[PDB]
Amino acid sequence: CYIQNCPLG
């Protein structure tokens, strides 16, 4: 994922 959320994909 990324921050609280996921990056690409």
UniProtKB/Swiss-Prot annotation:
This is Oxytocin. It comes from the Eukaryota. Disulfide bonds join 1-6. It comes from Homo sapiens. The chain holds residues 20 to 28 of 125 of the full protein. The modification Glycine amide is found at residue 9.
